[PDB]
Design a protein around this nucleic acid. Sequence first.
RNA 1: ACAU
DNA 2: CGATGT
Length: 136
Amino acid sequence: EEIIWESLSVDVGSQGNPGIVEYKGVDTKTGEVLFEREPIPIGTNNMGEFLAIVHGLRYLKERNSRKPIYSDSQTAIKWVKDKKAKSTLVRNEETALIWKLVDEAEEWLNTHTYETPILKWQTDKWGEIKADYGRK
RNA sequence: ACAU
DNA sequence: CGATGT
Ligand SMILES: [K+]
Ligand SMILES: [K+]
Ligand SMILES: [K+]
Ligand SMILES: [Mg+2]
Ligand SMILES: [Mg+2]
């Protein structure tokens, strides 16, 4: 199994979990940063990994790109497949923003179509995903 | 266990 | 060491 280098790699970064969440997408081949989300003051790792995939899908669809997306998140890959983000994060005023974005990502999934393959980045074999934040 |  | 998830 080899890396499909013609792909978009996404990843979350956090300060705390739950904590400040951000995410970015990069060209798997070159590392060029293609998008970066403004930090969200409270979310979970898995909410951010989910938002990152969905943003990638929208980014690639807007550009008429058939590239696959790599994610290292088993959880978020499944949530996108299911079109349902099964987060445990409490809903209150401080988590309102992340839940709004998660709700809206689900809604996008339920109103749009895509053929984009969503692939597991095999960290054990390949090292850190190219979108990783270098914080671990 | 596995993946973050 | 702790947290998020299947
Ligand atoms: K990191
Ligand atoms: K990882
Ligand atoms: K666990
Ligand atoms: Mg990740
Ligand atoms: Mg990472």
